[PDB]
Short mmCIF file of C-alpha atoms and ligand atoms in Angstrom, two decimals:
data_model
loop_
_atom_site.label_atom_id
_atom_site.label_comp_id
_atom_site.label_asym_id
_atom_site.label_seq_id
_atom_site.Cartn_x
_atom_site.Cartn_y
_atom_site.Cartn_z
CA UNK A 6 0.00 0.00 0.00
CA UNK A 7 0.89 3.81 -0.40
CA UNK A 8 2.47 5.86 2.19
CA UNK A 9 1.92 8.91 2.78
CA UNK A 10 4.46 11.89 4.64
CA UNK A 11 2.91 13.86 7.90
CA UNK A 12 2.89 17.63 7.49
CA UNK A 13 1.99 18.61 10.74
CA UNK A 14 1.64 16.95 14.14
CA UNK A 15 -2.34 15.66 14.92
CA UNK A 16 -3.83 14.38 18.13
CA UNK A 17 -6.50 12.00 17.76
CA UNK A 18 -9.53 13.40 19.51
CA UNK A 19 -12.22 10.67 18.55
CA UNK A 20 -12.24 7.09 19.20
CA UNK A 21 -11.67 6.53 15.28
CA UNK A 22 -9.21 8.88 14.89
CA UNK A 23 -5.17 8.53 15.12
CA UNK A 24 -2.20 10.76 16.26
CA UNK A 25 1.00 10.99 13.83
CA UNK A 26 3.46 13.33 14.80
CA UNK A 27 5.15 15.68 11.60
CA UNK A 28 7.40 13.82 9.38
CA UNK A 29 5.90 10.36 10.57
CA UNK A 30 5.63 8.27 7.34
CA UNK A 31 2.10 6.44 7.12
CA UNK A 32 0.52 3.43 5.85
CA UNK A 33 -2.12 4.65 3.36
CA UNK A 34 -5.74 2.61 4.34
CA UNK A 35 -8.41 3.90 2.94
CA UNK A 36 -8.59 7.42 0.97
CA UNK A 37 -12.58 7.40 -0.63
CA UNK A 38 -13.23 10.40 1.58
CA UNK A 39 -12.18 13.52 0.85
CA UNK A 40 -11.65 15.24 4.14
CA UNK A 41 -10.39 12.39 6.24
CA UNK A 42 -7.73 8.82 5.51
CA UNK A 43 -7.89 5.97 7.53
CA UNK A 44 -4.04 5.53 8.09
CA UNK A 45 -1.40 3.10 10.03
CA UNK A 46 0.79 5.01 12.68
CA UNK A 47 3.06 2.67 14.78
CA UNK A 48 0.60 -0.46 15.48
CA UNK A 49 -2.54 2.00 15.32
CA UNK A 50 -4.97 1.86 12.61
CA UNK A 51 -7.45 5.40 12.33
CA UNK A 52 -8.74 8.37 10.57
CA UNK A 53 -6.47 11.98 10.01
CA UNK A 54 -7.19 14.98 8.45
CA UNK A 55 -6.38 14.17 4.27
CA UNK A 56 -5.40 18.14 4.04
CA UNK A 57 -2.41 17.37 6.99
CA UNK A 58 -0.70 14.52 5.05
CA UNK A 59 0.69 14.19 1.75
CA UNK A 60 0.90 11.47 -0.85
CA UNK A 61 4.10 9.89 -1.90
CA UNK A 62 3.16 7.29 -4.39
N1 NH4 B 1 -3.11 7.14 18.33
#
């Protein structure tokens, strides 16, 4: 799967959500929504903010 770069630092602050701290590199889920990606951080699966992270193939 994808990964994607961390532009800024996020706390999770729902149940669904995930934190990923600037320059983390991600595991790409699940990007059919527009606003939010379901991403793998560490050994967490959750949702962040699709503006805050960027694509890398
Ligand atoms: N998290």
């Amino acid at each position: 799967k994808a990964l994607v770069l961390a532009l800024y630092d996020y706390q999770e602050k729902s149940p669904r959500e995930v934190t990923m701290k600037k320059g983390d590199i991600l595991t790409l889920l699940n990007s059919t929504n527009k606003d939010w990606w379901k991403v793998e951080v560490n050994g967490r699966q959750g949702f962040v903010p699709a503006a805050y992270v960027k694509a890398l193939d």
